[PDB]
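I had to read the description of the data format several times before I understood it. For illustration, here is how one protein appears when written out as sequence plus structure tokens:
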Amino acid sequence: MEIKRFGRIREVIPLPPLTEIQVESYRRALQADVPPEKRENVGIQAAFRETFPIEEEDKGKGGLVLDFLEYRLGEPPFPQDECREKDLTYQAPLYARLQLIHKDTGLIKEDEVFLGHIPLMTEDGSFIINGADRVIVSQIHRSPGVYFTPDPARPGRYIASIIPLPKRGPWIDLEVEPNGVVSMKVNKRKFPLVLLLRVLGYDQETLARELGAYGELVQGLMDESVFAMRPEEALIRLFTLLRPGDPPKRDKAVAYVYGLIADPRRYDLGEAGRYKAEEKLGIRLSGRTLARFEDGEFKDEVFLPTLRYLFALTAGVPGHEVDDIDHLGNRRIRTVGELMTDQFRVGLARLARGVRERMLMGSEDSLTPAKLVNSRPLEAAIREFFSRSQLSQFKDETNPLSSLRHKRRISALGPGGLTRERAGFDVRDVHRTHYGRICPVETPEGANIGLITSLAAYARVDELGFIRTPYRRVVGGVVTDEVVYMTATEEDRYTIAQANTPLEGNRIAAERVVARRKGEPVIVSPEEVEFMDVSPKQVFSVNTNLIPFLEHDDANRALMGSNMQTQAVPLIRAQAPVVMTGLEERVVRDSLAALYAEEDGEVAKVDGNRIVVRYEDGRLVEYPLRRFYRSNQGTALDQRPRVVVGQRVRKGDLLADGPASENGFLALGQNVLVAIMPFDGYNFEDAIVISEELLKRDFYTSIHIERYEIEARDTKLGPERITRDIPHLSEAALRDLDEEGVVRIGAEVKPGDILVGRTSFKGESEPTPEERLLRSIFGEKARDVKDTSLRVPPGEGGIVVRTVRLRRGDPGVELKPGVREVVRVYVAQKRKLQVGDKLANRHGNKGVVAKILPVEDMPHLPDGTPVDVILNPLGVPSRMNLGQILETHLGLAGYFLGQRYISPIFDGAKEPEIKELLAQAFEVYFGKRKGEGFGVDKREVEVLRRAEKLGLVTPGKTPEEQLKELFLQGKVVLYDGRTGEPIEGPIVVGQMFIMKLYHMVEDKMHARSTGPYSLITQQPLGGKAQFGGQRFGEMEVWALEAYGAAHTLQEMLTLKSDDIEGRNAAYEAIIKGEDVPEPSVPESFRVLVKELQALALDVQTLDEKDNPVDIFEGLASKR
């Protein structure tokens, strides 16, 4: 096979490390690989320094100084796989150096205290919390700064906002309502903007003239002069303004709080907050946030500039001071590291809280180790974030691509501080700045609609979570190969152009060429083009980039296509698309599906379980291959060796293929020849007709594994024994229960077979009088033990492949309390494609198999080769994704030309280039036909007749020539298969890639006859083996109500769900073939009446004449 790739836009730079976000964030987060000497001090070390110097001075005796030296964590308790076999949280041990000082001679240094076991990251970027690999999804929010937004209801003038995160930490607003008041609010109630400047030292005269000479608003400032005439007294006066009934005297205490340390922030001095400053408003910052504690007299280079800019914003063009909040230079992305560092610091505070109490509890000086440190907080805290945070979830590894995406996805629903469930509608939409920074497709149509999405191609989190998107520079009419990752904000200052601009190299080629200033499409000139787009790829996400001709598909349906791939299941037979975009390679590679060769060398052994290669460096290493592992969602992950024995390997070449790779290429589902016409009704709205032949070959077939588990619980009635003993009826069911108790590996288990046996006790506390007689009659001596045995749940099982049992003397495992022992049973099964299944191409055409046709009679081409699947055309006009029809065509060429292609995103193949390849295909198709010995059918000629009358072929040309034309159009003649006659009119056909979608647990069609019932609510409930009833909602009630369905609705409310006495007599009646009984009162009704009686109210039903009647049959009358 050969590869031909069409578009030419010089791809200047390789895509970045896809999991860089997850990997590097945790790198900077926990800087543990490098000594405390190394400078990166953010994250852990930062959070540590933040709360370590615990100064506790006076109330009794103090002068406490506990100081941090160096943070070191290094020897993991156990390893990865052992952490999955056994329930274990892969976490590194950490204990930093600590030394507490004394006001008396002595400083005790108790070196280590290991508090907090913090999880580690896998080399791919995923975690391992408890058994399941988990992932921490990034988030978005208002980057702590100051903005000015238009006022709420009064059309008049807008107000100022100062945003300080963490939560604890004031939230300021400056608003002027001139009849006599100005408003500045910290927690809530407002006060004067000048009483404060006065406090700091700004007097009426110097203030008003320098700041607002150009600003008449200065008059509101010098207004209440009575108080402006006393400096430091203004300090006490504002204190007075706050409200508790506090001591007037507190020298410089609260001013400190809004001064240097806590409330304002320790975000790195320099670029954290001072960036939002010098560019947006005001020039300097002395001390991180408005901070100072040297003379008692505070300095505030921030309090005056904010007003300075409000006087400026309100008075003209110092610049145009309006902040579009959604500008990404305002909305920041929280990489993993930050998310963990914050929970780590929260724990540090919980820790430092308890320690303070113990600076008073310890008797004399030996209080360094246990007296100050308790590991209970940090454990619960960080543990809670990895197992319970709404943000970290099961790794979605249906197929690698999936998990990769789930690792990079961004969420709102988080801290609660940033964006909750209320809407913020504007945020949900795809903002202008989302360019190269977020996929415009990447959003879950439905409930949580704009609140989530995975990021883009070249998108990278620079220093602080600001997705900078790359844009290359173009000085004059010259375009460069240099790139600038720009902030959202700066992007608007320049005139940027799209990549589609005809380029000669550094030369722009057309005078009137498109560019877009700031969210506005603008036809600019080559001389104005300041910057240019990097690529068509950076615009979207990975998951999306994988789509062929994205260019021709409605952005709405292209979403479906992207989410579809996230639902792709690994087939034992994985093939790459006949037509690819170009990243399939990089996907499998950057994801960790296939195994690549470190350095050059030769191959030694090629097992089905290992490839021990020999590098030319004089070394050889064994490369195990995850034979058959269980993915979180139950898909097979096997590495099939692609290298033979003794082979010189290039550095970075596929030794084995990942779960779904063919040859280092991503491959899901399989390329199948497909006709695109209507069949009877088999493909009616969105139904798919499939050729039986597809099953003959093991084409769409997938291996699944479910993990049934049972426990031996300790009841006070007697331990539940796990034995081959199944008390009541046969040995026939005990065969596969070979091992005494457990089931034998390799045994075929059907629904209702014993997977594992167990024996618990009969009653709650007492034996049975009636059951006493029966046992005695045929065999008194009857093991009173109950059959509580894990059985195959309806639905399906396969053949047991592995089993695990953990008994009494536990190795290094965690058995829950009461839990005597556990028994796992891994079962595997081959899933061959069937009518229930759903398959869908990358474009979005989704559909279910409705009929598997015998190759005998499905559409067949002139040469005996028949089509595998017949897709309905109707599904194409409405939806707008011609891309699939473009794929099919290139596919046809690749079938006869025996070649695969790579059509980039928007630069790819072009309609003429394809008509070209089709022209070559015509000779392979029909050229052989010529030589093989035959010409054209009566049929082939006949469909030509109807085709020229149609208008597909130039009348007057020879059939040979006419068919070429007809072929180039992408359609060929097809005969029925059932009749052998032709299908009037050419029909297109070709090689379209189609994947098979994963079957959810719901897919296991749930059918329930009778079963359990809830304890307080008496409505049907399922769980383990009984399916659980379907819900009959109001919307459905009305449906019946509309109909004359009286009884049928009664039934739905009585006999079927709540009529306690009803459902019982119901069953029994049915059992005897009795026309079911007439409904008794529903328990929902009785539950109610009583609920109602619980409250004073008395609800009594009445008769024809206002008289009693009785709902509660006979249990309410007394005694």
Q: What stands out?
A: Residues 325 and 1015 are 51 Å apart (CA to CA). The radius of gyration is 37 Å. The first strand starts at residue 2 and ends at 5. The chain is about 25% helix and 20% strand.
